[PDB]
């Protein structure tokens, strides 16, 4: 008599018989939190390779349900979106686990990257907005329990390995939920040491100057070559389009001209016509930039560098954000980010730049909802 499974593009939801909406929730991850492998291997050998993680678990769940907590699972299962784990098989595994736990659960399953993948709070919002009969949930009175908690190596005998991820802890931080690991919650073990990511998108801002030094000017009245430098996926092209190309700068993209000679001819022709040029590429190294500086030198026009300050993790954050929110965004691969960092050398005046502007990494004028999303951790 369970309502059963609902299937959405990037979400599965199961609602067991006996689930009731409530004003407070006790939520759990699945793998490594309520279950682990029966085989004793790190990864399951089959769909049936599971056992309840600790014998203490069903007693705690019975107590929570009697106290009026709605019991919920929030589980990341990317293998489904990637075609490695059949949805219909995973659904059966979940039902079997729930039968063994012996209490009514509502389960939410993030099958893909993006809005629903912890730590992004998409599943919470779905629970609250669509799957709780309109009853507001007190986050302060709720709890999330998971093993992707960013713990350091050796927090217990047999754990010479740090947690694979901090996604569970960060999900709870994004929602504002009190958080505990499975051992802290079910076994009353002392709290384990953990680390958060170095980049905290909650401290991102829209304030401050667009570029430094403020006494400089984005535009020049005369021909010149501007060389943009910075990680891909962190908003360079958008900036360049908004502030330079819109002002008549000729956009040069070496990647699409093919050869170097065609790129310089293009630059030279623009300058000969009295135009200004911007090179909108990553340009991470001295040799990469030297070609454009030499071109400018040969033409007798100034070369300036716009140096975008975005760090690798800011850029990767921005890229994930745009993947989730902008249907036209071209995803930047981790390979390309990695490659850029490996090749990067900071620009200096000795290369031959007239001046270097720094472009700080700042929040876009995004919709209120998108600004809330921008401030969420999106990778564990
Ligand atoms: Mg887990």
């Amino acid at each position: 008599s369970s309502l059963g499974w609902e299937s959405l593009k990037k979400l599965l939801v199961f609602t067991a018989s006996g689930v009731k909406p409530q004003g407070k929730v006790a939520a759990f991850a699945l793998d490594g939190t309520l279950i682990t492998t029966r085989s004793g291997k790190v990864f399951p050998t089959s769909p049936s390779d599971w056992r309840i993680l600790y014998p203490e678990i069903p007693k705690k769940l019975q107590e929570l349900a009697a106290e009026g907590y709605k019991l919920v699972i929030f589980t990341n299962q990317m293998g489904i979106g990637r075609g490695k784990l059949p949805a219909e098989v995973f659904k059966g595994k979940v039902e079997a686990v729930l039968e063994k736990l012996g209490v009514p659960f509502q389960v939410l399953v993030a099958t893909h990257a993006g809005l629903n993948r912890k730590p992004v709070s998409g599943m919470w919002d779905h629970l609250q907005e669509q799957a709780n009969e309109g009853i507001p949930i007190s986050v302060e009175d709720s709890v999330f329990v998971g093993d992707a908690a960013g713990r350091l190596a050796n927090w217990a005998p047999g754990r010479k390995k740090k947690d694979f991820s901090c996604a569970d802890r960060l999900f709870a931080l994004n929602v504002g939920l009190p958080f505990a690991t499975p051992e802290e919650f079910f076994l009353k073990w002392p709290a384990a040491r953990f680390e958060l990511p170095a980049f905290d998108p909650r401290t991102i801002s829209s304030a401050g100057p667009l570029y430094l030094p403020e006494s400089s000017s984005l535009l020049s009245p005369n021909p010149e070559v501007v060389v943009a430098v910075g990680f891909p996926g962190a908003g360079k092209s958008t900036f360049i389009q908004e502030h330079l190309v819109s002002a008549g700068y000729v956009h040069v993209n070496r990647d699409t001209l093919g050869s170097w000679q065609r790129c310089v001819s293009s630059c030279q022709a623009a300058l000969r016509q009295g135009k200004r040029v911007v090179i909108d590429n990553t340009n991470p190294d001295v040799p990469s930039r030297a070609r454009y500086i030499q071109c400018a030198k040969d033409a007798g026009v100034p070369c300036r560098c716009f140096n975008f300050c975005a760090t690798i993790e800011q850029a990767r954050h921005n890229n994930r954000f745009r993947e989730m929110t902008d249907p036209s965004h071209a995803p930047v691969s981790d390979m390309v980010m990695f490659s850029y960092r490996k090749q990067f050398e900071p620009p200096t005046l000795a290369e031959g730049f007239l001046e270097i502007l720094e472009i700080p990494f700042r929040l876009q004028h995004l919709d209120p909802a998108l600004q809330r999303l921008y401030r969420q951790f999106s990778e564990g």
Side-chain angles (χ1 to χ4, degrees), residues 1-8 10-260 262-290 292-341 343-363 366-380:
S1 67
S2 63
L3 169 61
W5 291 95
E6 293 171 304
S7 174
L8 299 86
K10 302 194 186 176
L11 185 70
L12 305 176
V13 180
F14 181 76
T15 303
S17 181
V19 172
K20 296 187 203 303
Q22 301 291 352
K24 62 181 181 188
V25 164
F28 301 84
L30 175 62
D31 297 319
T33 295
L34 293 179
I35 65 180
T36 185
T37 60
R38 181 171 185 174
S39 68
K41 300 181 100 166
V42 174
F43 298 113
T45 62
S46 78
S48 67
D49 188 10
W50 65 267
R51 59 166 179 85
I52 300 316
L53 174 69
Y54 300 128
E56 285 87 351
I57 288 174
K59 179 176 186 280
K60 183 60 172 193
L61 298 177
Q62 283 285 335
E63 291 165 347
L64 291 165
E67 285 176 358
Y69 292 86
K70 188 185 198 181
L71 302 182
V72 177
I73 291 162
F74 292 124
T75 185
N76 278 358
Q77 299 291 337
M78 298 304 111
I80 300 182
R82 300 269 183 263
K84 298 302 180 71
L85 173 58
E88 64 265 32
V89 170
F90 181 72
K91 282 172 174 182
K93 181 182 186 180
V94 165
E95 293 188 37
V97 168
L98 295 188
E99 195 94 338
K100 180 58 186 174
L101 292 174
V103 284
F105 263 95
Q106 188 169 52
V107 186
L108 293 87
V109 185
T111 55
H112 291 72
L115 290 174
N116 295 328
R117 181 169 174 76
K118 297 177 293 177
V120 186
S121 71
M123 289 189 280
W124 183 265
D125 299 328
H126 185 90
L127 163 65
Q128 173 70 93
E129 297 169 10
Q130 308 290 333
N132 204 47
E133 302 196 10
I135 301 182
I137 301 158
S138 173
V139 175
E140 298 91 340
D141 286 330
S142 298
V143 60
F144 185 55
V145 184
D147 66 297
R151 290 170 291 187
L152 315 174
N154 295 315
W155 57 273
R159 342 270 173 156
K160 284 61 175 111
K161 334 192 99 175
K162 62 207 290 181
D163 285 335
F164 76 109
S165 171
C166 193
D168 290 328
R169 187 179 302 276
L170 295 179
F171 175 84
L173 229 52
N174 285 331
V175 176
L177 290 161
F179 177 78
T181 66
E183 297 73 28
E184 291 156 14
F185 193 73
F186 293 118
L187 310 182
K188 285 173 155 43
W189 288 14
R193 301 190 70 187
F194 63 95
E195 280 186 353
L196 298 182
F199 172 54
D200 186 336
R202 296 175 297 179
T203 112
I204 208 61
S205 172
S206 185
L210 184 63
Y211 63 86
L212 295 168
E214 301 177 56
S215 63
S216 290
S217 291
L218 278 188
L219 308 175
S220 174
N222 305 313
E224 70 160 346
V225 177
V226 169
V227 174
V229 173
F231 281 90
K236 290 199 306 291
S237 299
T238 299
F239 183 103
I240 290 174
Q241 173 61 48
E242 179 163 359
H243 300 292
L244 300 186
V245 181
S246 69
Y249 276 60
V250 179
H251 189 284
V252 162
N253 179 359
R254 162 70 136 98
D255 291 352
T256 65
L257 280 48
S259 63
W260 166 235
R262 182 161 181 240
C263 183
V264 312
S265 292
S266 163
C267 197
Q268 293 172 341
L271 298 176
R272 268 200 309 280
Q273 294 155 9
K275 301 192 176 157
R276 284 110 9 124
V277 174
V278 59
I279 308 308
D280 175 24
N281 280 117
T282 52
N283 303 308
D285 61 283
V286 168
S288 288
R289 296 188 294 263
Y292 299 105
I293 295 170
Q294 185 67 58
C295 180
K297 257 184 283 189
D298 293 348
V301 307
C303 193
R304 298 193 292 147
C305 177
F306 288 14
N307 191 30
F308 290 76
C309 303
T311 62
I312 192 177
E313 292 313 333
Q314 291 174 329
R316 291 182 69 257
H317 178 84
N318 193 63
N319 175 70
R320 284 191 299 273
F321 175 82
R322 290 181 178 197
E323 290 200 44
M324 293 188 287
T325 63
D326 177 357
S328 296
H329 178 69
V332 173
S333 70
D334 283 337
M335 288 303 314
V336 292
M337 294 293 192
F338 168 74
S339 168
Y340 180 94
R341 176 164 80 172
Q343 298 166 9
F344 183 74
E345 326 179 42
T348 70
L349 293 175
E351 294 178 46
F353 293 116
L354 171 62
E355 82 174 331
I356 298 177
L357 297 196
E358 289 181 4
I359 318 302
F361 184 74
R362 283 165 51 255
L363 177 70
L366 291 155
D367 165 275
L370 288 192
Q371 299 192 31
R372 301 197 295 271
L373 178 59
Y374 202 92
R375 292 178 190 285
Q376 295 193 25
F377 294 92
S378 60
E379 184 180 72

